[PDB]
Design a protein around this ligand. Structure first.
Ligand SMILES: [Cu+2]
Ligand SMILES: [Cu+2]
Lengths: 98, 98
């Protein structure tokens, strides 16, 4: 089903919650800015086509709570991503499209 | 309701079809690359906050048919936009959020 991922947990941690989501090809994932802004979504290119990873990324930073970004995943695969400003804190995620 | 806008008409014209869509605040619009690529979505900032217009834009160019971009409009207003490479051809659109 379509998935919603919180950027910054309710418990106040620099994480994507849930960190791993599984969807069906053709579905979308919406990231909603929650706590400890700012955040962004950058997909790494290992295991998936470099250009697809780029098209799925949203490099602009989100500041206000409730702001969101949506990406539609039409091709099956394992897409790992991260929040640039919080990479050191380990704010990483994964989307499995089947 | 959620709206889908074709970038490049079935009749083979450099236009957004439908050029004007009306949605309810909170809903989203999905632009799907159809014909005469490439295309992108850039919202102009007159009548709406400059930063909101930027957050709604998708500057990257789409080439393959079926590729898409999604933007969620949570704030009411009239958002006019255009396709950068086809501005001269008059490829412009409008989203009315109520
Ligand atoms: Cu972050
Ligand atoms: Cu165009």
């Amino acid at each position: 089903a379509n998935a919603t991922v919180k950027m910054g947990s309710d418990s106040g941690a620099l994480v994507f919650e849930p960190s791993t989501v599984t969807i069906k090809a053709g579905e979308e994932v919406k990231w909603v800015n929650n706590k400890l802004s700012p955040h962004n979504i950058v997909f790494d290119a290992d295991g998936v086509p470099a250009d697809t990873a780029a098209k799925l990324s949203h490099k602009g930073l989100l500041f206000a709570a409730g702001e969101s970004f949506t990406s539609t995943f039409t091709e099956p695969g394992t897409y790992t991503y991260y929040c640039e400003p919080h990479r050191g804190a380990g704010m990483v995620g994964k989307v499995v499209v089947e």
